[PDB]
Amino acid sequence: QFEERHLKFLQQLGKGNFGSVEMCRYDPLQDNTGEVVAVKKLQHSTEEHLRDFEREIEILKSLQHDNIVKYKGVCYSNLKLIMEYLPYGSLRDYLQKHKERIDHIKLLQYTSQICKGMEYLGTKRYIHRDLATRNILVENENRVKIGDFGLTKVLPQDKEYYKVKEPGESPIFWYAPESLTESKFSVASDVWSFGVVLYELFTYIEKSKSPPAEFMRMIGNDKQGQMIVFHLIELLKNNGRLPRPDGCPDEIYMIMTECWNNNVNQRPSFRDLALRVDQIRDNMAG
Template sequence: MHAILFPPVLLKPCLVRPPLWGAEYCYFHTHSILGIKTYIDPDTYEDPSLAVHEFAKEIDPSRIRIERVIGAGEFGEVCSGRLKTPGKRDIPVAIKTLKGGYVDRQRKDFLREASIMGQFDHPNIIRLEGVVTKSRPVMIVVEYMENGSLDSFLRKHDGHFTVIQLVGMLRGIASGMKYLSDMGYVHRDLAARNILVNSNLMCKVSDFGLSRVLEDDPEAAYTTSGGKIPIRWTAPEAIAYRKFSSASDAWSYGIVMWEVMSYGERPYWEMSNQDVILSIEEGYRLPAPMGCPAALHQLMLHCWQKERNHRPKFTDIVSFLDKLIRNPSSLHTVVEDVLVMPDSPGEVPEYPLFVSVIDWLDSIKMGQYKNNFMAAGFTTLDVVSRMSIE
């Protein structure tokens, strides 16, 4: 996988408002690099309420009808309801509320997520409808996702989907992550619990508040001086040195792939966090879930490369999944059938991503037999998987 090198781009600064430093205030506002908007950290604003109004629309609370409580967030309840749009149409929404008795710090943390979400515009990223900040309760209003979080949705429908449907879900998540990565935003907490699913099985990346409690299970988050980290989903360099990047998001994406293909199983099962950290360090990687196509487990293993520069970029992941979707026979070979996979899941093979028999032969250093395979009719991985010794 080769990075595409672009010529340097001159960024034009635009004077907006003072961030936290300096007497002469200059601020690089939303600018375009090769036509792609870049993300601005709301913490660079001296007053966080200015950031939220820069990126989120204020909604008149009379346009919101709260119907029922659907969950609890760190800061208050999450409800479903309806929002009357300026065109007088009612649309379903989810409403996060900030519970009474909050301090300014909590209000700032709560609205920070809206300041982040409001900068994004992509079909696979949860859409912010707006905020209520001028009356109580303070609210964040987002599009409503009928099927809730991906992990519980998959557990509820264990075994119900075709491999192509699952790959379609993974492709949507990768597309959303490619968009975030192109904008220079690092998610840090990519996990199936933070992906929402609508009635069309469309997956959208959500949960952009970084200060929240990451999991209810105190065992599941490892505390460092900079806050809690969800160990099972986090790349080794991010756990050890807090080096978060799009490459650490790619590691987490590999775990999300595993969660999807196992219908919401818990990564590393009942292993303790400390055992997970030590096992990863020693080279252990999650084995393929039952019935998982070999090509998908290979992609997972690529995402879990120890050296972060060796992991695929989200643009590579999207194009690889597109190839699989266009060539469904490449998904017929499941890991149990592929004799060349390592005996121990602790070994990470250095295979390139492949979708054709020719690529596969090259990857196992048998490229000289291409013509023999083609002549004998072994033209797809599916046919190869059914080869017998005769």
């Protein structure tokens, strides 16, 4: 539906996994009245990555929710995914730049919207596998959207988990234990990663407080490569956990820690997380 020749490059926005996203103007009348859109492409096209990308596109096309980035279409010559452009960029960058202006009530509004977008995903038996603030986008001051689905899988019909081990860089510092040890991904592992997203938000993305920096400090920074994952596994098994962020209330920390349960079946559901967060937001209005 979108023709290559009318897509004008404006800037690179970011890179992630094996994808790249650009700001472009789609201007088929060539009178500079077209809309700005976001365009996702493969950094390096292979046959493997293209088939994954096609599935990614079909996944996003299938999702319609206030807190999920909107699909607009595709562009063929090398496949490109065209999405709505959200002008405040990624939540990771936004939070960092505006920390002095974003309060806890606002972080909890973002948290609630993330939970609802995630509950909608589970409704379609989709496992996100990559929840992190870098993957959430800001539409305006009062609304975020889950903004990338690069690693998202559909559960098989007969199982509540999906086993996968991709080559490359895995975001191991957001992973549930059973994802690290067994390569199992489920709604419950997404709940684990949501807890890390919640941790991220309450750190306001202070660099020295990122999950990689805190876990690497807990493991020892002398560790390289293959030994990191092994020491991370042992840490989590021994109930090593990210600390409570500066300023975070106990009740918000308890949500995180409950998400970070080694027992996959004892982690809360996305519907219950939303309820609890919304109840805490309501208790801050009075």
